[PDB]
């Protein structure tokens, strides 16, 4: 991921009143993913055959 000059300048504080970036700004990167799976129901039970 390549960030932006707006993010770079907002990271540093010194912004005037009612500007949001008056204090130094810290960011974090979060990533999620969605996948498939198989569930087997037998013997009145459950579990992933492939785990």
């Amino acid at each position: 991921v390549t960030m932006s000059p707006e993010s770079v300048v907002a990271a540093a504080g010194g912004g005037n009143n009612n500007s949001g970036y008056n204090e130094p700004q810290r960011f974090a990167l979060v990533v999620i993913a969605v996948n498939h799976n198989v569930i087997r129901i037998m013997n009145g039970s459950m579990g992933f055959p492939i785990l």
């Binding site: 039970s45 579990g47 992933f48 785990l51």
Partner: protein
């Protein structure tokens, strides 16, 4: 409904048919052998000059 919850019968389990992540195979790397370049200096020899 013939569906009581008390029986602690937790079945037998579930067979792990496969793993989600395959195990990579690394190349085998042995080490020294019988002639593993060792110092023994038994003879030190004697090379007579031919001329």
């Amino acid at each position: 409904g013939a569906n009581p919850f008390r029986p602690p019968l937790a079945h037998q389990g579930l067979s792990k048919a496969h793993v989600v992540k395959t195990a990579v195979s690394v190349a085998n790397r042995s080490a020294g052998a019988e002639p593993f370049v060792t110092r023994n200096d038994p003879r030190a020899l004697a090379m007579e000059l031919a001329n």
